[PDB]
Design a protein around this nucleic acid. Structure first.
Ligand SMILES: *C(=O)[C@@H](N)CCCC[NH3+]
Ligand SMILES: [K+]
Ligand SMILES: [Mg+2]
Ligand SMILES: [Mg+2]
Ligand SMILES: [Mg+2]
Ligand SMILES: [Mg+2]
Ligand SMILES: [Mg+2]
Ligand SMILES: [Mg+2]
Ligand SMILES: [Mg+2]
Ligand SMILES: [Mg+2]
Ligand SMILES: [Mg+2]
Ligand SMILES: [Mg+2]
Ligand SMILES: [Mg+2]
Ligand SMILES: [Mg+2]
Ligand SMILES: [Mg+2]
Ligand SMILES: [Mg+2]
Ligand SMILES: [Mg+2]
Ligand SMILES: [Mg+2]
Ligand SMILES: [Mg+2]
Ligand SMILES: [Mg+2]
Ligand SMILES: [Mg+2]
Ligand SMILES: [Mg+2]
Ligand SMILES: [Mg+2]
Ligand SMILES: [Mg+2]
Ligand SMILES: [Mg+2]
Ligand SMILES: [Mg+2]
Ligand SMILES: [Mg+2]
Ligand SMILES: [Mg+2]
Ligand SMILES: [Mg+2]
Ligand SMILES: [Mg+2]
Ligand SMILES: [Mg+2]
Ligand SMILES: [Mg+2]
Ligand SMILES: [Mg+2]
Ligand SMILES: [Mg+2]
Ligand SMILES: [Mg+2]
Ligand SMILES: [Mg+2]
Ligand SMILES: [Mg+2]
Ligand SMILES: [Mg+2]
Ligand SMILES: [Mg+2]
Ligand SMILES: [Mg+2]
Ligand SMILES: [Mg+2]
Ligand SMILES: [Mg+2]
Ligand SMILES: [Mg+2]
Ligand SMILES: [Mg+2]
Ligand SMILES: [Mg+2]
Ligand SMILES: [Mg+2]
Ligand SMILES: [Mg+2]
Ligand SMILES: [Mg+2]
Ligand SMILES: [Mg+2]
Ligand SMILES: [Mg+2]
Ligand SMILES: [Mg+2]
Ligand SMILES: [Mg+2]
Ligand SMILES: [Mg+2]
Ligand SMILES: [Mg+2]
Ligand SMILES: [Mg+2]
Ligand SMILES: [Mg+2]
Ligand SMILES: [Mg+2]
Ligand SMILES: [Mg+2]
Ligand SMILES: [Mg+2]
Ligand SMILES: [Mg+2]
Ligand SMILES: [Mg+2]
Ligand SMILES: [Mg+2]
Ligand SMILES: [Mg+2]
Ligand SMILES: [Mg+2]
Ligand SMILES: [Mg+2]
Ligand SMILES: [Mg+2]
Ligand SMILES: [Mg+2]
Ligand SMILES: [Mg+2]
Ligand SMILES: [Mg+2]
Ligand SMILES: [Mg+2]
Ligand SMILES: [Mg+2]
Ligand SMILES: [Mg+2]
Ligand SMILES: [Mg+2]
Ligand SMILES: [Mg+2]
Ligand SMILES: [Mg+2]
Ligand SMILES: [Mg+2]
Ligand SMILES: [Mg+2]
Ligand SMILES: [Mg+2]
Ligand SMILES: [Mg+2]
Ligand SMILES: [Mg+2]
Ligand SMILES: [Mg+2]
Ligand SMILES: [Mg+2]
Ligand SMILES: [Mg+2]
Ligand SMILES: [Mg+2]
Ligand SMILES: [Mg+2]
Ligand SMILES: [Mg+2]
Ligand SMILES: [Mg+2]
Ligand SMILES: [Mg+2]
Ligand SMILES: [Mg+2]
Ligand SMILES: [Mg+2]
Ligand SMILES: [Mg+2]
Ligand SMILES: [Mg+2]
Ligand SMILES: [Mg+2]
Ligand SMILES: [Mg+2]
Ligand SMILES: [Mg+2]
Ligand SMILES: [Mg+2]
Ligand SMILES: [Mg+2]
Ligand SMILES: [Mg+2]
Lengths: 88, 136
RNA sequence: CCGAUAAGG
RNA sequence: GCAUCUUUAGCUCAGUUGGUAGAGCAAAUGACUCUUAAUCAUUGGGUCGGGGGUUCGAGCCCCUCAAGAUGCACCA
RNA sequence: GGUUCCAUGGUGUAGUGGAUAACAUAUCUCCCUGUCACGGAGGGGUUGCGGGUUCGAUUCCCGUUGGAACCGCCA
RNA sequence: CCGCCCGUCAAACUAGUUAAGUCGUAACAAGG
RNA sequence: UUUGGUGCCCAUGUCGCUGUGGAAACACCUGGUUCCAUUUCGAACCCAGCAGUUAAGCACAGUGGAGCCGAAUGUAGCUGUUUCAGUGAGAAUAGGAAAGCACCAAGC
RNA sequence: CGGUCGCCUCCUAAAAGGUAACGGAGGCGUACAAAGGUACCUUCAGUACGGUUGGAAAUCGUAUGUAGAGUGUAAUGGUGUAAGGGUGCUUGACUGUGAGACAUACAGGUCGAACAGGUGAGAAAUCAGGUCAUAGUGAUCCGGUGGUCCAGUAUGGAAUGGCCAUCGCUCAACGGAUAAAAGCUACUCCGGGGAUAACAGGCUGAUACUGCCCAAGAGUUCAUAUCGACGGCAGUGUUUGGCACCUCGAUGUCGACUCAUCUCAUCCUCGAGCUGAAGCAGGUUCGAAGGGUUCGGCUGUUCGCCGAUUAAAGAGAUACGUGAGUUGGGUUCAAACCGUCGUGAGACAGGUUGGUCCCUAUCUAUUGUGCCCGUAGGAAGAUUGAAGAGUGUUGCUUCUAGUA
RNA sequence: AGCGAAAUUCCUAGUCGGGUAAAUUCCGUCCCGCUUGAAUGGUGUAACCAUCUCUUGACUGUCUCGGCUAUAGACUCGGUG
RNA sequence: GGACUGUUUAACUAAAACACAACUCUAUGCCAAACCGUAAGGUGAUGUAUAUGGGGUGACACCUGCCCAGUGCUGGAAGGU
RNA sequence: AGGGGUGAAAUUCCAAUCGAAAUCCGUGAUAGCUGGUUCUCGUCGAAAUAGCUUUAAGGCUAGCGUGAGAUCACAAAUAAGUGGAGGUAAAGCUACUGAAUGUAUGAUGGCGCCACCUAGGCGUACUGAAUACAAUUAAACUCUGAAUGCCAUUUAUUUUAUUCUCGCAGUCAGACAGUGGGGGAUAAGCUUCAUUGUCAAGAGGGGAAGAGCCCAGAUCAUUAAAUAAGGUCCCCAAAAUAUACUAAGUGGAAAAGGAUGUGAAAGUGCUAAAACAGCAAGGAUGUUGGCUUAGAAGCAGCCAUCGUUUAAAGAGUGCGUAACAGCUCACUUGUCGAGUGUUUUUGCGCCGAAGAUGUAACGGGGCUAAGUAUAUUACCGAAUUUAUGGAUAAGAUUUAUAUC
């Protein structure tokens, strides 16, 4: 005897968006490359770093990326692109 | 039968009883206590049996505290049912007892009755119990 | 249209 | 078998989900009438089936018995 | 064991696409009659429990009871 | 005639018998 | 060095309590006739002037009250190999703490 | 059969990203000419006090309060001078593009510096290629609409196409077979599968059965003579179950008959402890598997109820033992009818009548009986007995003694 | 209307009576007939059936319970195989 | 249970199944309806509604109740498509 | 006369065949499904994964293999150091959201008793807001918070490829073991994921026997040597010393629970001013207190749980008596002259422990060591390594066809 079985009601899931950090600290970067994909600003933008229509951080100039912790109780993260600054 | 009045989620993942003792490790309300030596899942039915045992073997002025509480529920699929078609329905509530958690404590009656009372409470529970006293 | 009227005296 | 329910004044049943019980009939009492019926008021009448346990407190919650009834096997 | 429907006054049933609940019987008061039935006038009485959404739930959503209607097969 | 009276249903005893049960009003007046 | 302005910082920078201060400046303040303004109010914003003013704000000294920060030891978890060597939290505690770093204008 | 089929959010997801299950919770197939863009101004909800209507809670004033407020929405993340609220002017909810990246099998998706044209806000710097962000969507083919600096089948047109923009699919089974499509087969057939079920085996032991631990109580009083709650720990594989490892180039599946064998958790017989054991007859526990453990009525039955006996009418295992030993009553072929379902062919662990059970034994196992050879010269007799096999049940009457 | 636990009844081995020492089958009756029922006909019906079902007399090896005898095999010898 | 005598699955089902005499409904006016073929031709029938074809029930006796909403069949004025 | 015939109807019969004859032809129908596919050697050598699929036993692309070419460093690996992202393990709940324990102050109601018909008041068997103290719980809680892992860079070393292009594939059924989880019941040799390994496609040695466990990676020959896991009484190659423990064949399978088994340790009480046990004596009075109970009065429930004498004595220690009573003990003293009593932490053992063919829960014989723990020096043990020789591939010196 099988006795019959009930039915499940929740078996739905969405595609996983590949968010997170893309360029790590110290890595050289050119303008227009993505540094951080997020839903809502988890990492604030600094100098030479822009914002998009999806809160995506992209570079604005050549240089080395660099994360600096700031904000109350050092709970806010900020990214920047320190220009090559070779300066001979 | 101790039972939470409401829960946000009917069917939670079971909580492991393997490990040392997180909280409820030292007698802090009474001065004699029933410590556990083997982590296990014990349900509200065993608590009520043990609590009723303590109360029947207590006196007219003894006072007791129950530390553990059956927060987590557990489910059980109905009999003769093949695997699939979702999780079963919640059946009984169990308190998670780890190795070293003081379950029951007693005070305000002589030592022999308290030792005897904790013994009858621990014979009602699956865990391997042990008597401990409160630090001065 | 128009039905009924408790028991023994 | 098993799981489930029921046992509540003389009878048929609500009790409420813990501060210890009423409803409708039956009985009686009056009132009422020549007297009754009927009516009307009023009214006494309980081991909450028996024990154990919880609780400060059990008709009320949990067990074991006693008597019946239910739903699941007189092996698909 | 699973699935669909229902729970509205004292009894039988409608409605409401959120802002509002009626019909009949029954009940009460008064005409009516020697009296009563029938008759006439007027009066009155309503969303199973919970929990969310909304400014607002009988209505919308998810659970919990009770009553039904369907199925539970092939070896 | 606010008289009389019939037949189902319900209860008991042995179709009958039963003080005050229920649904009608068939017959006795031109009984409508 | 002190006052005033401002950037960096984002409580060991706060909230509060007790006192002192103004020379220059900062401020309240004096009026709405001008530019400008109120979803209505010269309250605010904006004007043109410093009569009064140290309540405020502001600036200094004290205040361990609230808030914040938090050592060492030990412990829980981890990595290996052991059934012991590193890694080392959270909580708790002694305790610190009445901000700090630069630039500019004035008497110094 | 029921449920689901595309996209978005959280957890499982093990602190990069990714990661499944008929795992646990929810939503979407939009909304806004302002909820867009810009300039300026401005900052919670709640609570405390004080005040007509006015009430616990409408609005006002002051203070407190560090987000529990708002951010159209399901969640997550973000954001309290912000991305929240108000006002003025506007339409960048632009045209042609696009270096470089994210993520990806492809198709598609996401971010974007910067350039040219012409605008909006603003004194200017600057910002504006839709919204705080992630769901709000469908390929190709076919045909229709608007524009057009292209073609126009000898030439001029036209018809008909081309390019760009746009319209028609809960094509939702949502990478979409065709513009267009439901059922029965027990009258069946073919190719395969132990990739996958029904019988049995295997693993598990939820459930089932047996046992034990604590002692509340019941028991003329007394937990433990006999029971034993509320609880807990085991054993067996012994019911109902779970998995799908062996078998679909076939492992014959219920019951009955014949023959039985094994285990002990012992029904009788045998021995003993305790007793709420006077005697007789009992109750419970311990030891013990040598033997025995009946015949019938109804049902295919196992089971079960009933009748009469017995010392007793035990519980199980052995492919729920046993069809190359028997039977075929039952299940389950084709035939036929009843009830019910279906419009129907047909279907029902609903009911009933009828209905093909093959094999000469090669190996091994076993029951009997022989030949050869060995036992060291040969033969004829009589023995011991290592290792074994067979049987083992029990009742009634009398006496003891109507004695204890 | 008729019939009704039926070739139909799940619960159900329905209640009661009869048949037996004892009766899930049989006969009569009762009726909440889940889901009987009137030309896919309803209810009775003398005769008939290699039809189904139940009780019974005689009868018998069906059985308690097995035993004996005779043939053809099986078994031994010769031939085919 | 079938009224009966009969017929049936050659080679697993002989029956309650089929048939049967009987009842009823329906179509058919003769170049009849129905049927074989593509048609000729033919069966019906060298028959004529007391006749033929098809559907259902199945001796004999007593009965056959209500519903024309849906479907099927027949007829119908006009009207709409 | 066959998408036809016949059928008193069963899917009947139509040449031993009928859900639609037999035979030939289209035809070598089609089959994502079974089965089979034939000589040798050498080099290298997978996958059982993702997405889509009327797709799930199939197919395409990506991932993994192989052949050729390019890239020398900026490419890719192995170690050390540094920087960064994160929110898991843990921990915490006065840092939120839920759940939640006790104490104290207590809104609130229930419950009363009054007054008053509406404004209310005094206590609440009790419910319980908020606050303080102490303590808790969480995958979808976080004021915090690692390690590992991930990305990038620096240094050292190594390889021309794990990078790019082209040709040819196979693979889309996986299994088990350790670790972190989901479903299941903290069941499954269960199912679904992440990661480390083995098998698949891998022999050898250990595990008695075993695909997945441990040691490792087989070119061929050698009757050479050293070793890994594992082991050294015999089967079966190889051991001895020394120190303790076990008495159970424990070893050589098990839980809750129970026990004067034994060894070690750390404390505490008395003792030759006499210890403990036993023996010999006493072991009391009011009184038999009093309610209470038929009665209790040393031993029913009570009112409690008395006091003196005295060495000691209890409203008694039980038995027991209707109850007293009575026997008798807790307590004190004496013969007595060497050990006793208790607490805690540990090592090895006992019981709990019943299944079905035959010892059958060490592999067997056997073992009080041939069992357990420790220390020292040895040995055995693989197809591992070394040594001798034969064969062969690719790289170098170099061209004898020589050495690495
Ligand atoms: C049919 O119902 C079988 N599955 C039940 C067998 C029960 C045996 N105790
Ligand atoms: K098979
Ligand atoms: Mg996601
Ligand atoms: Mg009078
Ligand atoms: Mg069937
Ligand atoms: Mg001042
Ligand atoms: Mg379906
Ligand atoms: Mg992650
Ligand atoms: Mg990770
Ligand atoms: Mg939201
Ligand atoms: Mg605006
Ligand atoms: Mg906006
Ligand atoms: Mg088309
Ligand atoms: Mg032309
Ligand atoms: Mg699809
Ligand atoms: Mg897609
Ligand atoms: Mg086949
Ligand atoms: Mg299989
Ligand atoms: Mg099976
Ligand atoms: Mg078990
Ligand atoms: Mg006793
Ligand atoms: Mg087992
Ligand atoms: Mg059994
Ligand atoms: Mg599998
Ligand atoms: Mg097998
Ligand atoms: Mg075979
Ligand atoms: Mg065979
Ligand atoms: Mg066979
Ligand atoms: Mg025994
Ligand atoms: Mg013997
Ligand atoms: Mg008989
Ligand atoms: Mg079995
Ligand atoms: Mg069998
Ligand atoms: Mg058997
Ligand atoms: Mg079975
Ligand atoms: Mg056999
Ligand atoms: Mg057989
Ligand atoms: Mg045979
Ligand atoms: Mg056989
Ligand atoms: Mg048969
Ligand atoms: Mg037969
Ligand atoms: Mg048939
Ligand atoms: Mg029908
Ligand atoms: Mg022998
Ligand atoms: Mg009837
Ligand atoms: Mg009748
Ligand atoms: Mg019958
Ligand atoms: Mg009978
Ligand atoms: Mg029969
Ligand atoms: Mg009958
Ligand atoms: Mg019928
Ligand atoms: Mg009919
Ligand atoms: Mg009949
Ligand atoms: Mg016949
Ligand atoms: Mg012969
Ligand atoms: Mg011969
Ligand atoms: Mg016949
Ligand atoms: Mg015949
Ligand atoms: Mg035949
Ligand atoms: Mg025959
Ligand atoms: Mg013609
Ligand atoms: Mg003719
Ligand atoms: Mg017929
Ligand atoms: Mg008939
Ligand atoms: Mg009719
Ligand atoms: Mg009509
Ligand atoms: Mg018509
Ligand atoms: Mg065809
Ligand atoms: Mg047929
Ligand atoms: Mg033939
Ligand atoms: Mg072929
Ligand atoms: Mg095909
Ligand atoms: Mg190789
Ligand atoms: Mg692999
Ligand atoms: Mg993989
Ligand atoms: Mg396929
Ligand atoms: Mg490929
Ligand atoms: Mg945790
Ligand atoms: Mg909390
Ligand atoms: Mg896998
Ligand atoms: Mg798999
Ligand atoms: Mg695993
Ligand atoms: Mg798990
Ligand atoms: Mg798992
Ligand atoms: Mg597996
Ligand atoms: Mg393979
Ligand atoms: Mg191997
Ligand atoms: Mg081996
Ligand atoms: Mg090699
Ligand atoms: Mg050696
Ligand atoms: Mg070694
Ligand atoms: Mg040797
Ligand atoms: Mg052993
Ligand atoms: Mg001991
Ligand atoms: Mg010891
Ligand atoms: Mg073992
Ligand atoms: Mg060797
Ligand atoms: Mg080698």
């Amino acid at each position: 005897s099988k006795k019959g079985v009930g039915s499940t009601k929740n078996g739905r899931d969405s595609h996983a968006k590949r968010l997170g950090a893309k360029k790590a600290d110290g890595q050289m970067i050119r303008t227009g490359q993505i540094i951080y994909r997020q839903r809502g600003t988890r990492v604030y933008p600094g100098v030479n770093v822009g914002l998009g229509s999806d809160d995506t951080l992209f570079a604005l100039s050549d240089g080395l990326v660099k994360y600096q912790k700031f904000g109350p109780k050092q709970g806010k993260t900020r990214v920047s692109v320190v220009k090559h600054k070779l300066d001979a | 039968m101790l039972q939470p009045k409401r829960t946000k989620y009917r069917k939670p993942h079971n909580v492991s009883y393997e490990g040392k003792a997180k909280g409820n490790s030292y007698v802090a309300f009474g001065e004699y206590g029933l410590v556990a030596t083997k982590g296990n899942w014990i349900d509200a039915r065993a608590i009520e049996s043990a609590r009723i045992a303590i109360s029947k073997c207590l006196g007219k002025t003894g006072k007791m505290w129950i530390r553990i509480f059956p927060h987590m529920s557990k489910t059980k699929k109905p009999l003769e049912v093949r695997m699939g078609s979702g999780k079963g329905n919640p059946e009984f509530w169990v308190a998670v007892v780890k190795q070293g958690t003081v379950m029951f404590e007693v005070a305000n009656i002589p030592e022999s009755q308290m030792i005897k009372a904790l013994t009858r409470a621990g014979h009602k529970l699956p865990v391997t119990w042990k008597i401990l006293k409160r630090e001065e």
